[PDB]
Swiss-Prot record, chains A, C, D:
Assembly with partners or alone: Homododecamer. Interacts with the terminase complex composed of two small and one large terminase subunits.
NCBIfam families to which the protein is assigned, alphabetical: portal_lambda
Any single biological process term in GO: symbiont genome ejection through host cell envelope, long flexible tail mechanism
Main location: virion
Modification note: Proteolytically cleaved by the viral protease during capsid maturation.
Pfam (any one): Phage_portal_2
Places the protein is found: Virion
One CC-aspect GO term: viral portal complex
Entry's family note: Belongs to the siphoviridae portal protein family.
HAMAP family: PORTAL_LAMBDA
Protein name: Portal protein B
Function, in words: Forms the portal vertex of the capsid. This portal plays critical roles in head assembly, genome packaging, neck/tail attachment, and genome ejection. The portal protein multimerizes as a single ring-shaped homododecamer arranged around a central channel. Binds to the terminase subunits to form the packaging machine.
GO MF annotation list: DNA binding; structural molecule activity
Curated annotation (Swiss-Prot), chain B:
Keywords of this entry: Capsid protein, Host cytoplasm, Late protein, T=7 icosahedral capsid protein, Virion
Subunit structure: Homomultimer. Interacts with FI protein.
HAMAP family membership: CAPSID_LAMBDA
Origin species: Escherichia phage lambda (Bacteriophage lambda)
Designated name of the protein: Major capsid protein
Subcellular location: Virion; Host cytoplasm
DNA-binding found in the keyword field: no
Entry superkingdom: Viruses
Family: Belongs to the lambda phage major capsid protein family.
Role this protein plays: Assembles to form an icosahedral capsid with a T=7 symmetry. The icosahedral capsid is about 60 nm in diameter and composed of 415 major capsid proteins. The assembly is primed by the interaction between capsid assembly protease and portal dodecamer, and major capsid proteins assemble cooperatively to form the procapsid with the help of capsid scaffolding protein. Major capsid protein forms hexons and pentons of the icosahedron. Viral genomic DNA is packaged into the procapsid through the portal vertex.
A cellular component annotation (GO) from this entry: viral capsid
InterPro entries for this protein: Major_capsid_GpE
Length: 474, 335, 474, 474
């Protein structure tokens, strides 16, 4: 079985890139034919981004000498601008003109999960319906190959032109293949502009040094493919052969030496004996009507029957095989099957909350690992455009210029899915302890709750004043 | 009774036969030698057309593949009743120890043992490349003649016709006979090792003595081999083109001693002739259950409880060393 | 089976280095083909570093005579500088220009887990986008071999040039092999500069003295390889042979002596009997249509059938074999399988919290053992650069110079993953007891909580004043 | 099976030393091939030392007439000096220049666990980067053999030169064997200097009088070796023979006397019968295609078949064998397997906390037994060096000189792993009871908590004053 799937013995990058197309193609096959990939990407979406992905700008006020109040007001301005620019209802923020920021993050994270890499391009849109002429078009991974599909070279390696030190200079984007009859032409695309401008945002997780591509799926999913095939076929055979039945006719006849002599005489010159016996047996079956049930017994003149003696008859064991292996690959691939297909077998209280909190912290890990890159890159490009357009005003006491301290000025964090609910009592006792001991700040409280302290305080002011005015109890 | 690992010698000083002509060791998991099993020389010429490739090539089925290896298993006692070989003044207090006396006496016993098997193996070698016949024989054992197939022109004799003794001691040159016997040797001869008096009447001719170069003119590692075994191989010098050596090794038999070499004999051949060291099964339960059924040698130290309630060192082997090409050497008895 | 994998009997270093390439290559094979290594490295990442790795500078104020307040303010300055330098959004802190500090620690810890060693190099970047011209390029372990792949020598041993006493002087870095056709050339690299400068940070865990390389994985994982193979093959055979069926035809015929005489006469000169019988049987099967199901019965003229009598039919036992061995190697390799593939079988409350606290303390062990080295080395290099650039001001009353007391001045600790959550009630009763009895300090409280006392106090001030101003309840 | 492993009947020292090399070599084999030794040494590390090993100097103030306050201040000075000297970030405290104090203790305890002994040497480093010119190089146990590997003698016994009374005078250190081709030369090393200076710290646990070496591992682990082998092989055989199947062909034929007569006639002169029958059967199998499945039935002409009748078919029992024996050797070797490979089977509350507290107290035993020796020896050497350098000031009223009362002056204790957590409620109710009844002192409270009373009080002062200043609640 190791024949149809073969690992070379070498560093992972040189063991994957030669068989990149086959592994990725069979990955496409399984993610299309199989529901597990859809469920996994959907849960990753709903744990990492969830409803939305919220920007929070925190310029390094302490290091830059900027006042915290000026930083906070400038952040208010940039947050209002960014939310109003992102909430465009006409899907107009993409060059394809059919994806908002939500689906920017969606397709980016999905493709960085599947192929391990995502490709964003900051292009200059001309549609004047918005103040900001920068859109972000996502680039397929099929596009990145060496110019004219040539094999890897000295410095042109699977489509990326690098130096001897590996520094990613640029890329050869092959032309799109949709419809299925466009030819591919390779075009030069630099990774970033010299001034720090993020033109081609290439975010991938390298497992080792010098690696150019991300992680796969199929190269650990062939075994589900062939287990589902084998369980499927074995259930089919079991079902079809629980009551397969042979309906033949035998007789006494069979006078050993006499039967053999009759057969030999028929073979030599006395076939009339066989013809007469066949006629008698045909008359037998047409005067009997030899019929078993609703159907006719298949015509068998005496002396021939099937021997449907069977193989071993122990239990198939597939039960504990499949539970063990589903277990196995479930906290292999990472998301547990007791919800990837939802068993409720013997699961208990500590079971539930321990599994939930470890899995949720681990999704927080993946979120902070493979979402903040895209978030910061897009925010940096948008903030550069805003500074170009003088939408928001930089602090006058800027210790470093915007172009010099884009990292310092464009320092930001992002908020993923909403408020976690698992037990209730858990979150509420945590909340009461934090609010009584002061062990929670504005920033981490809002991180835990998916809200904002400024708005909760303003709305509590509104709550109290409306209760006082209408006669309610604050 | 001490463990197997107490078998450290680092003393491999066989007289240039099992180390230089007969390097080709083949210990087996099976009793006999199966020359059909040994690849030996491989069928080594034919190619295939530039369209497809041909059949499968095997070990080319040696005609005779059944001879009995000399399974030799001697032993001795290392009873701590002797005063031993005392290397000069390295603290005889440890000899006073039964532990040190017993361990270095098993050292001495076993080294005697492998040099015994080495000397019997050298007698096998001298029989082999002097007549092509070897006598696999012993009491309570049938004598099997193991023949490599030495040809008649490899057994032609100097006494036939004109003898070197019956020649001019001053003007006659035996070089003519040298190439005469070397031509039908299936190769080039580069050592002319004699037995002592054979070299004596060889050099009795003047032409020999003003044709030979006494100088080093170091040709190969044979000088290093002589420096190692300065005992019985004697590098006489250069005869110009060819090296002149004399072997005067001696075996000390049951009651007397005598040279390995016969009175006046010669073998003309190369220093790189192919020599097989096929080795049979080792009949020791220890060897089988630890997988030393296919090896060179096996030592052990072991105690007998009961009638011979003692302790012994046991050495077991099974060599059947032969020569791949008996025609490689021309064997001549001299005048 | 011990044939394809062989341990010599010798000290571990001389038992591993001769077979270094084979063991490491099969380790690559299993970490690429198998999901367990990916899950293990991911959990090690999320337990050791987690979200981030936080620096805290504590110069030995008491020993150096430095005031604690001056040390704390100087630490504030260096922490602001280090966070703003580390938060670079363009991935520019590496020579490869594609990894931030997070992935510095990520690749370093991953490679120090796999090969047991990590190789960092402090190089002088020329990119002026940042104030600090020092980057840190990580060096592959394949690079360290003797000059031109020569075997170990007297003092040149597997690529490291040492003295008789073993002191690691320098290294022979072979040239990179990506693309798969660059030749290797060996270049000299000293371990550290004489002035204490950390040029080549070589952090590895030696199991014994004189050892040069770290620990492996495959040399304890071959047994999972071959157990997964054997369970896979045995399930395949069981599935395919639960209903394998032989469909042959026998007849009565068989008149012993007569049949034998007929066969002998056919063999001698009377093959016409066999031809006639074969013709009669062919007419038999073409006038019967001998058909069992949806398929035709394979053509068998009488007198020959398969004997599919089986082997023993006891239960395979693989169930308790595999549970025992998964158990076995799970708290062998160290991380328990009841989460490396997530079983919830009969697991209880004391089960959960005992296992969780012991495993988490043990990850704290690994963190403090294999992360603080890299953290301190990188911090020392960065602080040396900062002192060169006069970014932060050393205390004027320095009892020892910076170069003399780099260890004393650059004394630091680091914080790994965030706030542990397992039970809730546990952490909260611990917190209330510590805050009532005073049994927790600033430093260990912040270690337990993943926060900072200064910022929690400042934000509590902000909390109270905003509640007072807006009308809320402090 | 007792053949490959043999105990003599004699005192343990003379029963181990003759077979020292073989037992230690197979111990190396199993600790390298097997994960149990790695897990055991790792847990011993994390229970004995854990994060760090803390010095606490308590000179006998009461006996020496020293004031307790002067002793405490002098201890403060020596503790600051020792921590700053130990925290060297360049790994420079060893002659190998690659191990700090942590890995001093690590390798020492690991080797004193494996071989039962550890060998430290106090050497005079010349590297002037630190004030203290004393380093401590650890010495391999392979080095200690009689001069030139001679067997034991009257007073030169396995490398140690002693008197008739056994007093260990010195040692014969063989030269290192790395690379694998250095010769060994034996050098004289005294155990200690006459003035009480600890030059060659030889710490081992002797089971009886006159014993020179410590305890082993393999001499109780051969049975795991051969049980793992036997379970491995028996699972392989069970898996391969659950569905081994013989596919031969038989026929009716077999006319007893006629078949025997035909065979005899063939043997004598009538082989043409056998040739004709073989031809007929070859035509049979080439006109039938006798094929069972996806594969061809192996060619068997009639009259020969395999008899694969089996042995007994009872359950193997290996299940309860292995549970009983794992149980057995688990609280043999000492650390329970319900965490050496982590079973959660039927384990309960009293189970958990009783097992945990007994095992932890027993690790406290091992810690105080095999760590305090090395700690006190290293502290004595370092304190002697400090007195030489006048780093810390001895009390002026010294009743005895430093050289005379090194034990009295250098009296010290050490703290191992951090604060134990098992249940929470347990530790907190213990803490509240101790703090209400006063049944806990500074020293044993800090021993239980892994903290310091002076620092907890100073930090509580800081806590209260910062809460008062910022407006929080003390």
């Amino acid at each position: 079985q190791l024949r149809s799937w073969n690992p070379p013995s070498e560093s992972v990058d040189a063991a994957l890139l030669p068989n990149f197309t086959r592994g990725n193609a069979r990955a496409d096959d399984l993610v299309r034919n199989n529901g597990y990939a859809a469920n996994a990407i959907q849960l990753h979406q709903d744990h990492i981004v969830g409803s939305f992905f919220r920007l929070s700008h925190r310029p390094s006020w302490r290091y830059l000498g900027i006042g915290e109040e000026e930083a906070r007001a400038f952040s208010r301005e940039v947050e209002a601008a960014w939310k109003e620019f992102a909430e465009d209802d006409c899907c107009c923020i993409d060059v394809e003109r059919k994806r908002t920021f939500t689906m920017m993050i969606r397709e980016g994270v999905a493709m960085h999960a599947f192929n391990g890499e995502l490709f964003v391009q900051a292009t200059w849109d001309t549609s004047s319906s918005r103040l900001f002429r920068t859109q972000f078009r996502m680039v397929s991974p099929k596009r990145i190959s060496n110019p004219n599909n040539t094999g890897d070279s000295r410095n042109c390696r699977a489509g990326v032109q690098i130096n001897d030190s590996g520094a990613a200079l640029g890329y050869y984007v092959s032309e799109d293949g949709y419809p299925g009859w466009m030819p591919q032409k390779w075009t030069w695309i630099p990774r970033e502009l010299p001034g720090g401008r993020a033109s081609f945002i290439h975010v991938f997780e390298p497992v080792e040094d010098g690696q150019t591509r991300g992680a796969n799926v199929f190269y650990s999913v062939m075994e589900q493919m062939k287990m589902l095939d084998t369980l499927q076929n074995t259930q089919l055979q079991s079902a079809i052969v629980k009551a397969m039945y042979a309906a033949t006719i035998e007789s006494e006849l069979d006078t050993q030496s006499a039967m053999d002599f009759i057969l030999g005489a028929n073979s030599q010159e006395q076939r009339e004996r066989l013809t007469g016996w066949i006629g008698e047996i045909a008359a037998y079956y047409a005067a009997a009507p030899v019929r078993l049930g609703g159907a006719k017994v298949p015509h068998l003149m005496p002396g021939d029957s099937l021997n449907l003696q069977t193989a071993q008859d122990t239990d198939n064991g597939y039960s504990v095989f499949e539970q063990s292996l589903l277990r196995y690959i479930a906290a292999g691939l990472g998301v547990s099957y007791e919800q990837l297909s939802r068993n409720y077998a013997q699961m208990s209280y500590s079971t539930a909350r321990a599994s939930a909190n470890e899995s949720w912290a681990y999704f927080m890990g993946r979120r902070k690992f493979v979402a903040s890159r895209q978030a910061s890159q897009m925010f940096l490009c948008w903030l550069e455009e805003a500074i170009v357009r003088r939408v928001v005003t930089l602090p006058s006491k800027a210790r470093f210029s915007f172009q010099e301290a884009r990292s310092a000025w464009g320092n930001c964090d992002w908020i993923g899915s909403g408020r976690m609910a698992i037990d209730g009592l858990k979150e509420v006792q945590e909340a009461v302890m934090l609010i009584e001991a002061g062990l929670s700040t504005y920033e981490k409280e809002c991180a835990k709750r998916g809200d904002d302290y400024q708005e909760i305080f303003a709305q509590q002011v509104r709550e109290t004043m409306e209760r006082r005015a209408a006669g309610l109890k604050p | 009774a001490q463990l197997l690992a107490a078998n450290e010698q680092k003393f491999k000083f066989d007289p240039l036969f099992l180390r230089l002509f007969f390097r080709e060791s083949y210990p087996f998991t099976t009793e006999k030698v199966y020359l059909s099993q040994i690849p030996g020389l491989v069928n080594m010429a034919l190619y295939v057309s530039p369209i497809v490739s041909g059949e499968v090539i095997r070990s080319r089925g040696g005609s005779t593949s059944e001879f009995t290896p000399g399974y030799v298993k001697p032993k001795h006692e290392v009873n701590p009743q002797m005063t031993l070989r005392r290397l000069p003044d390295e603290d005889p207090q440890n000899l006073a120890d039964p532990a040190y006396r017993r361990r270095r006496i098993i050292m001495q016993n076993m080294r005697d043992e492998e040099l015994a098997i080495a000397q019997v193996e050298e007698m096998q070698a001298v029989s082999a490349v002097l007549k092509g016949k070897y006598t696999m024989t012993g009491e309570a054992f049938d004598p099997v003649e193991v023949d490599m197939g030495r040809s008649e022109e490899n057994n032609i004799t100097q006494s036939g016709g004109t003898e070197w003794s019956k020649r001019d001691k001053s003007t006659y040159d035996p070089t003519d006979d040298i190439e005469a016997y070397a031509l039908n040797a299936s190769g080039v001869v580069n050592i002319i090792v004699f037995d002592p008096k054979g070299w004596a009447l060889f050099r009795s001719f003047k032409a020999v003595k003003e044709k030979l170069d006494t100088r080093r003119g170091s040709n190969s590692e044979l000088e290093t081999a002589v420096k190692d075994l300065g005992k019985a191989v004697s590098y006489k010098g250069m005869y110009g083109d060819v090296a002149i050596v004399v072997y005067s090794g001696q075996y000390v038999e049951n009651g007397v001693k005598k040279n390995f070499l016969p009175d006046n004999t010669m073998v003309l051949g190369n220093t790189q002739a192919r020599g097989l060291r096929t080795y049979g099964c080792i009949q020791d339960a220890d060897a089988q259950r630890e997988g030393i059924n296919a090896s060179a040698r096996y030592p052990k130290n072991w105690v007998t409880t009961g009638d011979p309630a003692r302790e012994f060192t046991m050495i077991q082997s099974a060599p059947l060393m032969l020569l791949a090409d008996p025609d490689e050497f021309v064997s001549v008895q001299l005048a």
